[PDB]
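fwd from M.: "can u put these together and see what the complex looks like"

so here's what she sent:
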Amino acid sequence: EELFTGVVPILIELDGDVNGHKFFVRGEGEGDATIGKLSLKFIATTGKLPVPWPTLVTTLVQAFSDFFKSAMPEGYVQERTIYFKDDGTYKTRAEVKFEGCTLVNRIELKGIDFKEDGNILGHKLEYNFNSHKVYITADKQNNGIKANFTIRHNVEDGSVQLADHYQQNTPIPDDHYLSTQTILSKDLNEKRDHMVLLEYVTAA
Amino acid sequence: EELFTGVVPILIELDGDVNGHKFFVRGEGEGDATIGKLSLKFIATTGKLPVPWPTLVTTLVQAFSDFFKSAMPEGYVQERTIYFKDDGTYKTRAEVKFEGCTLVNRIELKGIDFKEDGNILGHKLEYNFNSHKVYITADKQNNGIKANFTIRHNVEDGSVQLADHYQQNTPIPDDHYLSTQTILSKDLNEKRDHMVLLEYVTAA
């Protein structure tokens, strides 16, 4: 927790493969646990993203709110299976840890079997992200924590795309809620496909 | 230099003794070497300061501009003798180094023999600070660097108070200039005696 008594630089790196569409996203910014504030800018370095930006926000640092903080500097592994309803599945594996002074989130993401001309691959989701409390329980078989939550993404037409997340975390914890509010925006001077992201994370 | 590729929190601690008037100043803020920006707030924790705030600015992180950067994380010792003309002398010894992620500047300062009802002890200096280039040479007898510079503080009446600094730095470097521009201000909501300080440091 010593490390989170102020502003911390963040580097995020996502190597992704969705139906054979590979891409690399680099995120940069800072987090401040004293106020729970995350400010990040992400760049789809490899051209247009084959999936909607909102579908990657949960994959792209719960430390900035404590099992997450006390795992540092060594860090924690975050594994996750994200089922999109009537559609394919992300599988993700990430290490969150300190390198130098810069909390790094390094992620591998594999997306398998989703409809072309569907909400994800057809880019039919609105550029926003809505917040519900997440239940973080002890997972004492793996000496860590687990959580299960669904996420509602709004669709262009008016429908909703559900995305059921299952996640585990282990190092390299009494039950509690974690709430995350998220604004997504664009830099006006940025030519590249990108996402500006602002998050506030608190714990009940 | 790895450590200075972004924002870094700064804790400064000055234990001072001037003509037997003891005091402790705590500084907090951040530095960014990529742009050379220093933003600090200092609190005279022990009541009214027996000396003018501008006389302590040089004592209260040349790292944020490289001998200073490459000495990290271990850090460097900064020793200095500040002769005020027709008046007393500060003697200072400080360690600059990383503790956790927070570059710390810990200083001891002893001020000896100055007139009461003089510019320093009588508080006759204007609340500002003026910048001239500082010559940083190699000091190969002590395996470090040295510098000699005077500073002009403006006096209430219109006169000037010269303050001749002699300094040495060694760890725990081709010759070059270092320029530092400084604004001093007050927080409007701060009841305690304090100094807000904003500095830009560059190297020619």
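replying to her w this: The radius of gyration of chain A is 16 Å.
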